[PDB]
């Protein structure tokens, strides 16, 4: 294991907040935020912006315990966007389960923001991708099991991607200090 680099060189660590962004090795685009669906009018699913110039919002990491500590590709952690749409309960991600499109997608809130979707619980981390210097994927472990799936992208046409489970085409992102 080792310390998760943010694009200036400095390990991420607790109490840092982020902008999630495209690596330039794959796909474009901007950053992390929220948008609405056709069938969830509170924006409680994570979107990548189609535009580079939109930062999104910044992302801290939840860790157990309080003290001041770097990240590393080990750490287990949860993800929370520093900002809440108020119409949510929260804005920690979770994966939640489409029937529509077959994908467990990343949102935010609880069980009841996303009503007759089943709601997975779970932890990531963040993971070295492939050889780029300082580049990661994000990894999601769910509760109860043993293994993990890789995030990844998917275009559903909602003013942005989606970020779901795949074994695929995991998304290679960096991470920009956002303070």
């Known amino acids: 294991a080792e310390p998760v680099i943010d694009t200036d060189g400095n390990p991420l660590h607790r109490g840092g907040k982020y902008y999630i962004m495209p690596s330039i090795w794959g796909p474009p685009g901007?950053?992390?935020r929220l948008g609405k669906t056709e069938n969830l009018?509170?924006?409680v699913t994570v979107l990548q912006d189609y535009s580079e110039v939109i930062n999104g919002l910044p992302v801290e990491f939840n860790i157990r315990g309080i003290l001041p500590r770097?990240?590393?590709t080990d750490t287990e952690l949860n993800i929370e966007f520093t900002e809440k749409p108020n119409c949510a309960e929260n804005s920690r991600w979770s994966l939640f389960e489409d029937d529509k499109i077959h994908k467990a997608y990343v949102g935010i809130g609880d069980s009841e923001d996303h009503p007759?979707?089943?709601m997975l619980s779970g932890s990531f981390y963040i993971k070295k991708?492939?050889?780029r210097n300082n580049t990661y994927k994000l990894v999601f472990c769910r509760d109860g099991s043993s293994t993990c799936s890789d995030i990844g992208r998917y275009d559903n046409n909602e003013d942005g991607r989606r970020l779901i489970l795949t074994a695929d085409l995991p998304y290679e992102v960096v991470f920009v200090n956002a303070s």
Do not use: A
């Open 70 to 72: 770097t990240i590393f």
């Open 30 to 32: 901007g950053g992390l």
């Open 41 to 43: 009018n509170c924006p």
């Open 116 to 118: 007759d979707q089943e």
């Open 129 to 131: 991708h492939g050889l």
